[PDB]
Design a protein around this nucleic acid. Structure first.
Ligand code: MG
Ligand code: MG
Lengths: 94, 301, 267, 94, 300, 267
DNA sequence: TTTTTCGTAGCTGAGGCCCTCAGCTACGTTTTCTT
DNA sequence: TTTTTCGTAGCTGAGGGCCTCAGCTACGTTTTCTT
């Protein structure tokens, strides 16, 4: 089991509550919890299935280089970028 | 537009939360506690094995439904923290499990093997040769009084026996009652999650929580009662909260939620018999059971 | 045996009695002694005191859909009576007792005795035939285009209208039948004909009475061809359950079915 | 070293960049990283010192009951609440 | 209104990041890489021990200042990945450390003790009794050729010696890039510990002498085997994959965590304590602020 | 030690030469052979090619504030020349060499020779006396109310205006002095009078020339009593550094100080 | 006796918070070390 | 020879994205198990 963070934007109330089933919402659209791998994947399929027009990013603790990994769904001005294996965030121009 | 809601394994959950002072509703499909002033408090219901409803709570239909769908046991408790009522999915999801338990319970010799295993797990050694179940119960009575005396002397708490009033006793009895209540909560949760009936027991019988009493009695003095004595000696004004915190800590440190289902499975396994296969004359399952991320006893999709 | 359905209001305790309360004041007085079972329909809210009283007198609370067309949660989960569950289980575990129960189910289902002692698989065949015949008969009586029973357990929308209706009706029926089984104090998972499902016994009992009422109405509504078929079938089933005391007469049937084991019932 | 999440709102650009020194910003005001205890305390005094009129919540992975802990600075409609030692979030009315 | 910015320990950091194709600026006090189209990419500079600037990058004054203040080493590399230049805080923050190193380096017998320790750590056993530094360096030459041959046959890569033109074959290109990464983090570590990269014991009289010493201690334990692995994989563009491989080998063998203790141990073999301030000296008028970072980096 | 200060533009390479580029085109041609050291003032941006060239010819890049009133980063960190650092260190490590150096420093402070051979701590006493005396002298020459040297190393805003001015001036001076020390190729941390501070040697050298220019300017500005004293002092120090070649004349002084060890310099 | 009453989801428009940026001005600075 | 040129922080008003809610309508439902 490892720490999980889900950040949603412009997402239906359905998904907001659905995430609130397992995770603690500390700010609007920002959910925190602690889950196993398999549960994390199920939550991800929930997000992919219910996000609709919205966009979501999910980050979780690992024993990798940076201590965590993250993946996204939908379009956002801030999008992940690869630098020789290190994943950072690119901020696109308007 | 819609995706099913399912339970997650019990080992992956927080043991319990106590809710008091408010109405419990569902908002956007989430379990929520609302007080008189309008303050909302979301409760990650799926991430909890057991929800304790104290006096002054009022639960909506939708909330009970939701709690059942994610396989979270709702437990209504009175003051001094005793279990009063419970709500959850109507029953076990697997026929073979329930028939396994019942077959074990109905046959005296199998029953005896199971009880003997319970005794071995509880005390740390084999029960004496050729004893009936009631004689084992006698041995257990003796050892239990010895254990109460021992804890009473280790923590230095005056002990005049187990005593309670139905609406009280000394601090230590109140503490024991609340702690034991928490244990029965998570144990009933575990028994239901594993897919068995809380009513069908081996040592205790003919009671609505017989199996709960059996399994809980196996680890009670390993877990909740010492902590009850610790808190008793601390002499607090209102024991129940301190007992709740202490029980959560002891459950977490000794990995109770992780070991409860294997404990049950092992106990029953001591009968040396396999869960009965479906009769060959039976009608085949027309629609296959959906694969589940949760425990075997909870319903899915 | 007695039970009451409560709807739209809060269940509280006044003077040691169960009370249903709305904005207009006390809506329903329920003396504690008069009910073994309380069915909470949607729009209900349970006070702690009500639950406490229910525990004190050992009353079963069951959270249900309307008219019991859906069962969602139950108090006393797993069943509150050892003797009932063990009665059912003993019946299911013993080859010949089970055999008697199955034979009774098939006879009630065919209406008067099943053949001397044809085997069980053969009875399943004969009734498969009977069921197809019944589908055809209802199809001609209600005059509905029928190309057989066909449905996709993963996509609700690809069968024809009549199959949707049939599915929704049977769904509701499974609801009230589960309600009745819980009220009787038995486990829905432990069946005699059906096994290996959370509701095997529910299917066993439901298949007995399936064709008397709700499947015909599935056909009726199918011919009416409304905008929202499944919903109209659900509502119609609700009405049928309310008017014809379905849940109330389901319990004697269950008890009879089990009684066919020629083993003695509890209290 | 453990996983860290910082969520800022209505906070000066000074603090935004300052956090960007150590943490990865995956959404506006949402920073993720992996730090030791002492560094986390330092970041916290940076937040307490630079947040001004804004409000911040910081959550980090632990070996506690829920797998993580969190603390806040400044006023927010969503505020932490204690239930027998379990810390949840209360959402205050307008 | 303002709070100081300080370095964090090297062990707590990611080893390195390679930046290319863009201008590096400061926005709201943060290190940022901006490309031709306006795409911003924030780089957690404080969380990184070493930043590699590839061709086509242009670094602002503010950015260099910022990188120094959080004690992140900037390293300009050419392609084939070779280190070219470096930038960081002007020097060690502790007098006694530098005087310790210099005293060790200046005295032959102390120098010899340090070199002998280096040899023991590198090869896994004591150097033979009664040897000068040049004779130890001879022994090291022999063993090094032996190691190249051994790796060449274990990974099955054709080996015709260490060769490059200021071009070489794949294994040599890989070795050059990997070694470059190692020199990066090692220089970072040496500066963080508070020592001078120019003052070495085995290699001397070169701007990165001490870097060569320390790096040579762990080089064949770490970066060169990985160079051979990649060499046998035979990629189009060796350098990126060498980078990934080096990052992985650094994290797995906890290099950043062990580099400063390794240095401290190496010097400690001199059996001497870092010199105390002279009693005639002027007392420190304003006390050094306590730091969360390493001893060699400046604070507040 | 030839050097150039570059400001407001990008440093690139054209035809193997260092070039400073604006919107207006090439602003400054720098032949690679003519500079040992390039000081980058605020508003500069360094191209990769420039750095590569600087490495090829071994040119020191130093990121500085204006006129060198602040030092922020240095290429070749820790120093690029072993022999320089070892010269300095050997001087610092040996008791008698160190003593020769300290005595030379004090003689430069006093004008010409400190007393023949009475101890160092005692010289520090004399220098304290003389420093306070100088504060008083400047205070009376420029007519500034003087209640002694007072400042709070943690709160800049507590002392009087003149103390702020003095502190800011000495700050700038520490800037250019560090610049000069880096240009000479020595370590700022290794001092002879001051020790145990990252800039001990900087303090050593700076205290020699502190009172000739910038402290008097601190007093002048103090009496002018402007809105922003510290800023006016910084700008004034910048101007003084540019007009009077302070950094250029600092290096011979340093080399002289060290030369007093009567040990021979490198190349 | 003619008792529509409760809890929750979907939808939409109003209000408001706050992120993002263009455009303008001011700046090269967060210091002190023989108090 | 009269060459103000570059990079970055603070400020403010405009634009806009999205969270939050009041107020209204519709609803009790996410099913099938002898195909
Ligand atoms: Mg007992
Ligand atoms: Mg070598």
């Amino acid at each position: 089991m490892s720490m999980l963070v889900v950040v949603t934007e412009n997402v239906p109330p359905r998904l907001r509550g659905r995430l609130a089933i397992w995770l603690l919402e500390v700010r609007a659209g920002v959910y925190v919890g602690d889950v196993s791998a398999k549960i994390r994947e199920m939550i991800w399929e929930q997000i992919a299935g219910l996000a609709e027009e919205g966009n979501v990013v999910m980050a979780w603790a690992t024993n990798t280089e940076t201590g965590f990994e993250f993946q996204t769904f939908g379009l956002n001005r801030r999008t992940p970028v690869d630098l020789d294996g290190l994943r950072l965030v690119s901020f696109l121009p308007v | 537009t819609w995706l099913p809601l399912n339970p997650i394994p019990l080992k992956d959950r927080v043991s319990m939360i106590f809710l008091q002072y408010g109405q419990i509703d569902v908002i956007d499909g989430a379990f929520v506690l609302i007080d008189k002033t309008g303050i909302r408090t979301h409760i990650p219901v799926g991430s909890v094995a057991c929800i304790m409803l104290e006096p002054g709570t009022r639960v909506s239909h939708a909330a009970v439904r939701l709690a059942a769908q994610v396989g979270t046991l709702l437990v209504w408790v009175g003051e001094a923290g005793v279990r009063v009522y419970a709500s959850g999915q109507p029953g076990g999801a697997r026929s073979d499990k329930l028939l396994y338990q019942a077959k074990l319970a109905l046959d005296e010799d199998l029953r005896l093997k199971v009880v003997r295993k319970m005794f071995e797990l509880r005390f740390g050694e084999p029960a004496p040769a050729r004893r009936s179940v009631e004689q084992l119960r006698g041995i257990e009575g003796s050892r239990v009084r010895a254990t109460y005396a021992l804890l009473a002397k280790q923590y230095g708490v005056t002990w005049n026996g187990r005593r309670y009033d139905p609406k009280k006793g000394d601090t230590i009895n109140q503490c024991i009652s609340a702690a034991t209540s928490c244990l029965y909560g998570v144990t009933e949760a575990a028994i239901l999650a594993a897919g068995y009936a809380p009513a069908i027991g081996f040592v205790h019988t003919g009671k609505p929580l017989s199996f709960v009493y059996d399994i809980a009695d196996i680890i009670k003095f390993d877990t909740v009662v010492p902590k009850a004595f610790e808190i008793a000696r601390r002499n607090p004004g209102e024991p129940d909260r301190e007992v709740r915190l202490a029980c959560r800590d002891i459950f977490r440190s000794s990995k109770t939620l992780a070991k409860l289902i294997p404990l049950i499975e092992d106990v029953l396994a001591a009968g040396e018999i396999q869960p009965p296969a479906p009769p060959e004359d039976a009608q085949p399952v027309a629609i296959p059971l959906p694969v589940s991320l949760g425990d075997a006893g909870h319903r899915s999709s």
